[PDB]
Amino acid sequence: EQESVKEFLAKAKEDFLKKWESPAQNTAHLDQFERIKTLGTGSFGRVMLVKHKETGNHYAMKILDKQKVVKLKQIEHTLNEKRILQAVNFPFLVKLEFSFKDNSNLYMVMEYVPGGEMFSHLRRIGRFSEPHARFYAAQIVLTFEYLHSLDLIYRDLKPENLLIDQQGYIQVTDFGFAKRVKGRTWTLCGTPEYLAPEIILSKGYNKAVDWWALGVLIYEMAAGYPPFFADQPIQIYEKIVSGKVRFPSHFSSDLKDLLRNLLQVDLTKRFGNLKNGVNDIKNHKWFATTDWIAIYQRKVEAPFIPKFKGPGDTSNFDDYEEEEIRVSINEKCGKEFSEF
Ligand SMILES: CCCOc1ccc(OC)c(F)c1C(=O)c1ccc(C(=O)N[C@@H]2CNC[C@H]2NC(=O)c2ccc3[nH]ncc3c2)cc1
């Protein structure tokens, strides 16, 4: 009868409890970790596959230099990433298990997702079939619906920020540019191929940019390249603001229509931003075969599952220059990160 859904609830609840109960409390841990590999780098730090010595559990630890963040005046964005990650809760959002900080660095310890970024699989495959891209796009749509319901804008949608877990589902990562926006915001951020026209025009924008990004994402996933690709960034921006997009011949009619409605330069005509909102996308003919409830419950069988070999295997990840992380004997920028 209905007793099996109780067993499913109990199993998911035990997984959640274990994942809560083994991590250290916030700002209580020290470098008590074996550092295995760098999974990505940025202006102020890196993300490392990491093994907690006392537990043997593996995580992805984002390490950030406090001095570098302060010198480039990016305190608010890093605090935003930590606060948003610790405040949200959704199946397709990466989980922040715990966090700490020392004399030099900020540490955001997240769940480890061994399947790698979607960008790697897309580059090695060439492009996804339209059902594959639809499987990914439905999760992105639900995630944006949740986030926008929370008045949050993601602002960093790109194939590199979408990890694939062992079940083939998406884990959205990198929230350094996510921001709780009531009304408008003006910050220039995001990769050039995914920038919305209102961002390029420096006009002030809202959550609609996310939906624009989705269009781009879908296009890329279905074509193997972004819609406004060019060699120089200036031509990329010219093509983005031009209001013109050419689709490959293999694109179906429904996909072309959806993309034409998502890539609307006019904010007042872009899907996701209209009166019906996200429903305008969820009721589109391209998504007619999509069981939104089943996708949310992760009951749909994925079209692609990465080949794994246990936690600690990083074959699905690119290789980066490994560095030694040193912590000063003196505390840097303490009052600046008192809320972290
Ligand atoms: C132009 C660059 C400017 O860089 C900043 C700009 C602004 C800023 O302010 C907030 C910054 F801090 C920075 C940074 O320094 C920064 C340091 C490292 C990374 C990074 O590694 N990115 C990965 C590469 N592609 C996806 C990312 N993957 C995960 O995040 C992740 C998470 C959990 C996971 N679990 N399993 C796998 C797994 C993966 C990104 C930025």
Contact 271, 262 (CB under 8 A): yes
179 lines ligand 1 (CB under 6 A): no
Q: Which of 15, 31, 156, 210 is catalytic?
A: 156
Q: How far apart are CA 290 and CA 276, in angstroms?
A: 18
Looking from the CA of residue 113, the nearest atom of ligand 1 is 36
Q: Could you check whether 6-23+117-307 and 24-116+308-338 share the same CATH topology?
A: no
* 156 flagged as catalytic: yes
Contact 100, 30 (CB under 8 A): yes
Q: How far apart are CA 102 and CA 297, in angstroms?
A: 38
Give residue for tokens 């915001």: 185
Q: Nearest residue CA, atom 10 of ligand 1?
A: 176
- 161 among annotated binding-site residues: yes
Contact 153, 214 (CB under 8 A): no
One CATH from 3.30.200.20, 2.160.20.10, 3.40.190.10, 1.20.120.1200 for 24-116+308-338:
3.30.200.20
C-alpha separations of 6 from 123, 167, 293 in Å: 41, 22, 18
For the chain, how many residues are written? 340
209 lines ligand 1 (CB under 6 A): no
The ranges assigned to domains in the chain are: 6-23+117-307, 24-116+308-338
- 326 among annotated binding-site residues: no
Determination technique used: X-ray
Q: How far apart are CA 6 and CA 10, in angstroms?
A: 6
Sheet arrangement for strand 105-111: 33-41, 45-52, 58-65, 105-111, 96-101
Measured in Å, residue 313 CA sits from the centre of ligand 1 at 19
Topology (CATH) of 6-23+117-307: Transferase(Phosphotransferase); domain 1 (1.10.510)
Cβ neighbours, 10 Å, residue 331: 14
Contact 206, 181 (CB under 8 A): yes
The identity of residue 78, as a single letter, is T
Q: How far apart are CA 140 and CA 146, in angstroms?
A: 10
Q: How far apart are CA 58 and CA 41, in angstroms?
A: 19
Contact 58, 308 (CB under 8 A): no
Q: How far apart are CA 264 and CA 287, in angstroms?
A: 19
Looking from the CA of residue 114, the nearest atom of ligand 1 is 36
Cβ neighbours, 10 Å, residue 238: 13
Measured in Å, residue 84 CA sits from the centre of ligand 1 at 15
